[PDB]
Structure 1
Amino acid sequence: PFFPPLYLGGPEITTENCEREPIHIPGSIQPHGALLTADGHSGEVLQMSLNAATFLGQEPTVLRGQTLAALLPEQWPALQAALPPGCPDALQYRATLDWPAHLSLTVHRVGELLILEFEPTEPHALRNAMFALESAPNLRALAEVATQTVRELTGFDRVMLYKFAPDATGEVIAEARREGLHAFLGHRFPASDIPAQARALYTRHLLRLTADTRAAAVPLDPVLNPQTNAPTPLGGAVLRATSPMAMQYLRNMGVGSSLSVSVVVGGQLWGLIACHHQTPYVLPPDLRTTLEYLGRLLSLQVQVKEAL
């Protein structure tokens, strides 16, 4: 069972209990965006990331108790209709907000709570990218095409296809990398490097990232959902703070930015499209949506090719 989180008297995580870190409820976000939670009926703002002023122009204690009807009059009705009570928690409402300078708005529902993510935002290629994946004559060719295509889309210094063995050990079976980088191709890693609860989370929530592996997490306050007096589920929030233990591994690797997309075959975590940048790097929200779609196409092509 999960340890309590740090804000409920839980211990700091060590290599003795990697698998017990409740990574889905860090009660904090990454600083390149802002997060609000709001009542799924009233639209009352219940929780604020402490950096909410940077992106929304109001401090946490001023946003708290205001309604989305007031804060987002243009979107609040469509938001309500798009994410009704009982809808699946993977279902997203997406808008582009005009701000005095665009801001990408991503919302999902967890029970009676709306989770709002704000971050700055900036087809003939993508179609040939899809046909290129379809046209790979074997799994290795597919792996190479997938990593090259994602590297061209994103500009990431390294894109790997990280495949799980039945014992949950991991191997780099293909990679596209910048001139001068060490090869990881064929290198194998222990199961503990991506522990059991991360693997579980990655079967349901198919994309996660650390834009800056040195950035302190920004607290969500109040940290507990006032509805439940319990932690706010952030497994579906891309602005979710990353495991400190994971962040440290990346820093030691010389990685300033990390992003991965789940490859899911027959409802099991087959592997990851695993991306690194040496410098901190925010992949624009448009390019993430594209990478999500490519992971789903790649997941289907892997299932086929691997039967052969």
Structure 2
Amino acid sequence: MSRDPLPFFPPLYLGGPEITTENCEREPIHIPGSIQPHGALLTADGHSGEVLQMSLNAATFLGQEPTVLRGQTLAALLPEQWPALQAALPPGCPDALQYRATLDWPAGHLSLTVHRVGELLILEFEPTHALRNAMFALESAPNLRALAEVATQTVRELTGFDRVMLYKFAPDATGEVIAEARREGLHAFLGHRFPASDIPAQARALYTRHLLRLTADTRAAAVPLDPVLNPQTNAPTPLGGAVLRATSPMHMQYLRNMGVGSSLSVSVVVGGQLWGLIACHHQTPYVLPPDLRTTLEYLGRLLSLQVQVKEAADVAAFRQSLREHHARVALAAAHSLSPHDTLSDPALDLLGLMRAGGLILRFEGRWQTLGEVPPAPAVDALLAWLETQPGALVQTDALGQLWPADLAPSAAGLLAISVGEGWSECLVWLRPELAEPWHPGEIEEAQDLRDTLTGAL
């Protein structure tokens, strides 16, 4: 889930491998060299504004002759916008930043979206309060599930989409539909789980930076960029920040198998990490208007923050229940005439403090244990390994990977603190293999215990 994606294969127009379920992660979805036909795309030099590339539908769509359009400057094409465009998108700005305008064209009202990648401007053209009311229901939501339900119902009312889901990522990057608003007659996805590869790592990475993407018509063929390569670089044009970017054929096929005619998702990003997706399906082709997409992008940002805040409160609520327990222990440690007698007291329940299966206590050149632990030789080896570790805290949810593993029945997870320096005196909490991850609160609680014990002893 946090892993960097494997490096991309070349695209099909550069003779790249055919994409299968075995090589999902390596499809270069960001450089399809093509767009969706409900809009037109130009690329232009960031300095001169010379038009370098155009989609093959762009001449017809803008009503200019191909030869005339290619080579023209944005000064000539977009005299009113060109000045504002340069100011809004200065060199080195993020590629997610966008200049947007509304044009009159000989095709009525036309939406223009511009963004910058490297030395290249990418211009996308396409034809062109209920949220405010849902904000109360969003704020009121007493938990993540309730919030998910409100979000999906809200988005469905906004868009008219036949299905709207909140898809939540597990730490292994598998997903679960935790909420769903759907048209009567459709079978429910609610509660269904899906493998990591249904949204592969390069997609999840892309979706952490570019927060909305869509397929307007799942039966429509992509329109190529001409030339397909960027003349500046003689390399593929990055289209990750372009909403008109052509969708992965693999995914479009998957959509068609689901009888989905149109699709849209918005990223839910929490702590720089992709938490989930607002996933929308329509049975029929549907170009969602640009202004409504803006609304969904806003909803995504709001929901992201609501999750971050709610999760922070769960953490704080959990850590509060470790202070009461910690106080009991600090009290005992203050009076202690021997850490062995005090800390091994079942009444103190140092096991339960960390939701551990086992605990090793070493003090005064001897150790003892509570709960399920490895046998004495394994404990001795564990302690000998610990001595080699720098710092005063070691924590792992898979001891095997860090310390190559046979202790996994009782000691798959490990959390150890030095009570002083050198690990001559220490506590080691152990957890069995499924280990259940140490909560960040349990880690800080261990740090607090280190201080307390270091002082008291």
Summarize the alignment of residues 208-247 of structure 1 with structure 2, pairs less than 5 Å apart: 208-247=213-252
d(CA) in 2 for partners of 1:59, 1:171: 49
> What is the rounded CA distance, in whole Å, between the counterparts of 2:304 and 2:90 in structure 1?
30
Query: Contact 2:148/2:178 (CA < 8 Å) preserved in 1?
Result: yes
> How far off its partner does 1:256 sit?
0.4
On the 8 A contact 1:158/1:277 being kept in 2, the answer is: yes
Q: Does 1:117 align with 2:124?
A: yes
Distance 2:88 2:191 in 1: 45
Q: Secondary structure at the match of 2:285?
A: coil
- Per-residue deviation at 1:116? 0.1
Q: Are the counterparts in 1 of residues 63 and 106 from structure 2 also a CA contact under 8 Å? A: no
**Deviation at residue 154 of structure 1 after TM alignment:** 0.5
Q: CA deviation at 1:53?
A: 2.3
Q: How does 1:134-173 map to 2 (within 5 A)?
A: 134-173=139-178
Contact 2:100 2:112 in 1 (8 A): yes
User: Which of structures 1 and 2 has the larger relative contact order (alpha carbons within 8 angstroms, sep 6+)?
Assistant: 1
Contact 1:52 1:59 (C-alpha < 8 Å) held by counterparts = no
- Report the CA distance between 1:234 and its aligned residue: 0.3
1:274 is paired with a residue whose SS is: strand
1:54 Cα deviation after fit: 3.1
Whether the 8 Å CA contact 2:167–2:279 is kept in 1: the answer is yes
Shift >6 Å, 4+ stretches = none
CA contact (8 A) 1:49 1:60 kept: no
Q: Answer with 125-134 or 285-294: which moved more.
A: 125-134
Q: Please list the CA deviations of residues 73-107 of structure 1 after superposition, one character each: whole Å capped at 9, or x if unmatched.
A: 11111111111111221111000001235100000
User: Which consecutive unaligned segments of at least 5 residues does structure 2 have?
Assistant: 1-6, 311-455
Aligned alpha-carbon RMSD (Å): 2.9
Deviations 1:197-237 (A, max 9, x none): 00110001000000011111100010111001111000000
1:55, 1:119 within 8 Å by CA — same for their partners in 2? Answer: no
Contiguous gaps of at least 5 residues in structure 1: none
Map of 2:67 onto structure 1:
61
For the Cα contact (< 8 Å) 1:39–1:112, is it kept in 2?
Answer: yes
1:190-269 map, 5 Å:
190-269=195-274
1:59, distance to aligned residue in structure 2 (A):
4.0
How big is the shift at 1:15?
Answer: 1.2
In 2, Cα distance between equivalents of 1:272 and 1:7: 30
On the 8 A contact 2:130/2:158 being kept in 1, the answer is no
Larger radius of gyration: 2
- Superposed CA deviations along residues 226-259 of structure 1, whole A, max 9, x for unmatched, are 0011110000000000000000000000000000
Secondary structure in structure 1 of the residue aligned to 2:105:
coil
Question: Could you tell me whether the CA contact under 8 Å between 2:169 and 2:175 is conserved in 1?
Answer: yes
Confirm whether residue 94 of structure 1 aligns to residue 100 of structure 2.
yes
Distance 1:10 1:95 in 2: 36
Q: Which shows bigger deviation, 38-47 or 82-91?
A: 82-91
- Pairwise CA distance, 1:193: 0.6
Whether contact under 8 Å (1:224, 1:231) holds in the other structure is yes
The CA deviation at 1:12 is: 1.9
Q: What are the superposed Cα offsets for residues 121-165 of structure 1, whole Å, 9 maximum, x if unpaired?
A: 1xx432222222111111111000000000000000000000011
Whole-Å Cα distance in 1 between the matches of residues 231 and 55 of structure 2?
15
Give, in whole Å, the separation in 2 of the partners of 1:60 and 1:6.
25
**Contact 2:117 2:238 (8 Å CA) reproduced:** yes
How big is the shift at 1:11?
A: 1.8
CA–CA separation in structure 2 for the residues paired with 1:152 and 1:76: 37
Identity in percent: 100
TM-aligned CA distance change 1:59 to 1:30, over 3 Å: farther
* 8 Å Cα contact 2:11-2:31 kept in structure 1: yes
Q: Is the deviation greater in 292-301 or in 85-94?
A: 85-94
Give the TM-score, by structure 2 length: 0.65
Counterpart CA distance in 2 for 1:41 and 1:196 is 34
Give 3-state SS (helix, strand or coil) of 2:121's partner. strand
Native 8 Å contact 2:167 2:176 kept in 1: yes
TM norm structure 1: 0.97
- Shift, 1:275, TM fit: 0.1
User: Following the alignment from structure 2 to structure 1, what is the Cα–Cα distance between the partners of residues 236 and 83?
Assistant: 27
Greater helix share, 1 or 2? 2
Partner residue of 2:15 out of 3, 9, 15: 9
**Deviation of the 1:36 alpha carbon:** 0.1
